[PDB]
Amino acid sequence: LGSNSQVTVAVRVRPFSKREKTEKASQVVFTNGEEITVEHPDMKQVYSFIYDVSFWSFDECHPGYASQTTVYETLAAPLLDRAFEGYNTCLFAYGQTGSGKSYTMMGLNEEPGIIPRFCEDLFAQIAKKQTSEVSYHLEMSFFEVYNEKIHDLLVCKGENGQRKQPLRAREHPVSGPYVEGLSMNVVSSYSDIQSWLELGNKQRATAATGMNDKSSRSHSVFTLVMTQTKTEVVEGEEHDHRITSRINLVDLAGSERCSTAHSSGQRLKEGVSINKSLLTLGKVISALSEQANGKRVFIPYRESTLTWLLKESLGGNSKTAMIATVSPAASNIEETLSTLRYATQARLIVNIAKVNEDMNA
Amino acid sequence: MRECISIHVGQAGVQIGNACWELYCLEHGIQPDGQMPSDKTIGGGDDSFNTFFSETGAGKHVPRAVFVDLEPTVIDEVRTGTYRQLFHPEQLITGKEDAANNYARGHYTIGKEIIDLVLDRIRKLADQCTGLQGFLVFHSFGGGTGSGFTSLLMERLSVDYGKKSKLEFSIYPAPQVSTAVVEPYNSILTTHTTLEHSDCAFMVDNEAIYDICRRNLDIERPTYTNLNRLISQIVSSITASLRFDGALNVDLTEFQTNLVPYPRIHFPLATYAPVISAEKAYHEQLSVAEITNACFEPANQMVKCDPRHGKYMACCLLYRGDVVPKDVNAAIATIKTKRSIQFVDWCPTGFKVGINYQPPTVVPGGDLAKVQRAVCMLSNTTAIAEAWARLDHKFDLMYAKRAFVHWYVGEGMEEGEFSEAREDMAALEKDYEEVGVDSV
Amino acid sequence: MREIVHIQAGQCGNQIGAKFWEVISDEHGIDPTGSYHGDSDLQLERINVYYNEATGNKYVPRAILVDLEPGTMDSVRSGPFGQIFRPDNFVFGQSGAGNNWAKGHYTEGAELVDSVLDVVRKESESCDCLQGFQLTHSLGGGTGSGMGTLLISKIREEYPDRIMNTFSVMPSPKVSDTVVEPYNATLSVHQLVENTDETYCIDNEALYDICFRTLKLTTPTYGDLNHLVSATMSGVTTCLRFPGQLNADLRKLAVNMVPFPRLHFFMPGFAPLTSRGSQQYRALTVPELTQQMFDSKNMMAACDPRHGRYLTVAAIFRGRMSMKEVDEQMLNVQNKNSSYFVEWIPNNVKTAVCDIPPRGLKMSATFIGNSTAIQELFKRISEQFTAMFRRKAFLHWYTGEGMDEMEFTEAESNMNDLVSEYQQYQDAT
């Protein structure tokens, strides 16, 4: 039961952002096809990083320009086809503030990302195969992590200044962790998800910071549980054995220094928490890589809240994916190396994913 | 008029300051109350010089100090002690929230509530000065205050003043002795911010002074008082040219141009050789040659480093008392011949020299002797590459596992600012093997 | 000025607290009537830490008593140093915990913790600068463990930039004094591992062995055990009350002792401790104290440092002394006994030294160690549990007050994770 699965990792550069364009920034990152190289202004050394997929979005006519409908067909479409057999899947995004992860996963209204492509193509891939034989169920929830406190986003918050009930996490002995109080809503068509995402993202705690005009101050997790009830050789009752898959799509917050992102008051108090969570989302990658060499180790999952929920996603039973977004300016050289040196770590994680099927009993 | 503003950060800085001002006040005659009888004994003069003191119309001579710290268990000992009627009540203690031995707390969170006031007091001290030469920050690598708050102040003053020396005496971390598990981090994080503003960062280690006291004074139980007194003597010898008259007088801009070849190798070592009991005061001639050779003795350094694992690159030698010049030139000739004291191919001179006519003071209840010829040396070597490498390795054994960083992130620091401060020190350690490579 | 709010939950907590106030008052010069009758002036300068000034230069401590039975409240208020507290801070109730963790966190602490937090809000909003908290309790019962864990959670939600130091009397291997110890302790560990910054693990068997061997006592009561514990509690927080050459408050120690936010359970230890007769046959110097504090027989946590590796150690000296001898001795400990420390921390020690020693001593010292031996304690609690939970030994008295089996599995899993985190650093890298 189960198979070895190298964790999938992809890298992606963003075109020069407006503020750095006003500063007249020097390009530092280059792509020799697949391999990325980073040259300093110092040019004292030249680090090189190798990955499995290397996108490019600097300018729209370079040969090799991976658009929003290219980071699907190379990264997320395998995750979609791997969740038809039954394997659990994940796709989560690392980077710094302004590196472009909330533009890749969710896109913008005219440029949609992976969530809309995934969902609408899935429903396009369901009505192409759905018959009277095997059913197709889909539920979905959408939660966030704000200052070490889980919150739901599809809970229409009304008449108070703090309609923001803090939920909690718990550990099931077999099914692993789970959130208590999580609205798990049912969907049938893409027209049902667009009204949830439309409400969820309006609830996600965004703010205005020096790095970019709309900066997320939260990690967001987006679930889809798809169970297909199959029929096959039996004695009597059919529609019994069913294969279940859990697709989690995660959009994180960013490294954010206090100088580069002018902030005080409350902005600085959630900045710390993003940083502590992403300080622990590094230990979990580093120490899981150190398992590949036989070296016995402990993965500090419980040091934070996000890496406690996404615990079966990094290791565990999940075919996972790390999209790694990095800026091309020289002002963002002391933080792009940090992103890419963790992306190269993530590729070495071997996790065992197994098709999930339970016979009626 | 020459003037220098001595700033004293942290417990170590304040205690060195206490020793320093005890020493200066004995040297001039100004008493702890602030009064100067010597203006009323003979008829007048400049008995306590306005470089390191001020004047008030009633006759209270008042120092040019600031005495910053973020825990009140130390400045409140000054307010309550012998030197209470001397200092100005604006001693810029917070009362609150020590820096917890992390850079983050003293640089961004608990160090932003007092720096806007330090600059006010320094402005008030500098606007009342006709000719300002520089600063003298006395801090300690290892803690949060003396690592972070100094870095912040030295970034604000670099903007405000800019064309002024910003020298800094520091308690360098030892290889073996330590009082914290976080000194490597703090030091690496500090140099990053002070390899760009500061202009000469003088260093000492407490292990070196322990061993000095042991071998040269017969003290087997030395405390911080006796250490800080030797530091006070170094601070008197580096300042003796501004407060006295002598033959060769080295202003504080005459070090910056003679010891810092390149703008990043500005970490000189210090030493003060005639450390002697009253016992060995007799049975010693205590001449120039004996000292000058004693100052290049490895077992008479104030930093745990071997001078023979590098090459010298500059030396400034400052004497006090009955020193004639050719007693020096004979000695520099004695040192320019010895194969052990090895200099670079690009600095043949390397022997800046100063002389002064006021001998050293000695405090009662002290562990030092009355000497008519005191000496200090400020050297610039390639030996401290190994100390910096040791700190680099201490760091690298911990940042591998990201230990203690959740206590720095907590108070305003990202995790990419540790890798950005480790690269600069590697570049420096490479700029210490770029200099010992002989030219063609 | 730095300031601490002391809370005393349960019989153990209130007794140790009373003993601690009897010690701090002796140290600062306070009579039971709150009046100052001291000799020095270094007592009043930093009296805001533990005390508050009332009317006529009378001093009232910032104690917040708490309990569910009113039996130890009256033991205090009738006691010698009990008329110094504030009657509106003797929060109590009825309907004791029954040595049930359910009763203390869900039923009879849910009905009383709001009052305690009102007193906390009042004593914390009456402060220039707060440094943290200090709760004494007892893993093994319901009042201390339950109510204190809940209080810690509510405070660490309300005051999260502040310390929550906790002084805990853990259960002992050989003998039990309460029959449901493992469950209560496991739940309290589930609550404290996630909501503290420094925990000090005390065990009564270790104190018994101290009192029998070192102090050569024949009839040692609990007042003696608390006279030992009060001492080190005093010493953790003396560089906030007295001056010195190296000063180390609570946050410094938490930064220099906790490498990772979970491994903040420490073996405490005291210094000079000697037989009443055999003190003239001994010297009073730093080496004597360094070899008295780094020993197995002078700890309190019932755990052998020789069966582990010290991740950290901290040493708070009190007395006029040299720091050469301090640094040299701590280095000698790091060098000789190298196999009892960690490689990837180059210096595994912290040294704090102060100037004013205790009432009739010239040299005291206080040891706070973080070692990989503590897991054994937890290991035992993860074994007894497994024998009681695999058959549901006394579990219907926990379900019957609003609890579920999931809350036991979680705690077990987390305590075992803590053991594994202490264990991976027990090898040679």
Ligand SMILES: CC(=O)O[C@H]1C(=O)[C@@]2(C)[C@H]([C@H](OC(=O)c3ccccc3)[C@]3(O)C[C@H](OC(=O)[C@H](O)[C@@H](NC(=O)c4ccccc4)c4ccccc4)C(C)=C1C3(C)C)[C@]1(OC(C)=O)CO[C@@H]1C[C@@H]2O
């Ligand atoms: C001639 C002399 O010096 O008497 C000493 C003494 O000889 C010994 C026996 C004391 C004695 O301590 C004990 O007997 C003891 C009994 C049970 C549990 C713990 C201790 C002493 O009682 C303890 C007491 O220690 C103190 O005075 C401290 O202030 C101590 N006192 C209290 O806590 C205290 C408690 C209640 C009421 C009044 C004071 C203290 C320790 C830490 C922090 C603050 C205070 C002193 C001097 C002694 C005696 C009296 C024999 C020793 O203990 C301490 C804590 O220092 C035992 O070893 C030390 C020093 C000596 O060996």
Ligand SMILES: Nc1nc2c(ncn2[C@@H]2O[C@H](COP(=O)(O)OP(=O)(O)OP(=O)(O)O)[C@@H](O)[C@H]2O)c(=O)[nH]1
């Ligand atoms: N020479 C000398 N060194 C000292 C003295 N006091 C402390 N140090 C050294 O300074 C190091 C850091 O401690 P501190 O300087 O007191 O820390 P700080 O700068 O005051 O910052 P805080 O931690 O916030 O108090 C210690 O590790 C000691 O080695 C002193 O009196 N003399």
Ligand SMILES: Nc1ncnc2c1ncn2[C@@H]1O[C@H](COP(=O)(O)OP(=O)(O)NP(=O)(O)O)[C@@H](O)[C@H]1O
């Ligand atoms: N590949 C791209 N092409 C064009 N524009 C992009 C691209 N990637 C990012 N951007 C723009 O960059 C801006 C910042 O993107 P955003 O996704 O908000 O970064 P971020 O990581 O979400 N900030 P934060 O959430 O605080 O980390 C957006 O307005 C995007 O339009």
Ligand SMILES: Nc1nc2c(ncn2[C@@H]2O[C@H](COP(=O)(O)OP(=O)(O)O)[C@@H](O)[C@H]2O)c(=O)[nH]1
């Ligand atoms: N040191 C000390 N320990 C005590 C005392 N009373 C009880 N204990 C310990 O505390 C545990 C029981 O805690 P208990 O006081 O009953 O908690 P509570 O009933 O919920 O308040 C046992 O393991 C005892 O060893 C005391 O006075 N001193």
Ligand SMILES: [Mg+2]
């Ligand atoms: Mg975002």
Ligand SMILES: [Mg+2]
């Ligand atoms: Mg201090």
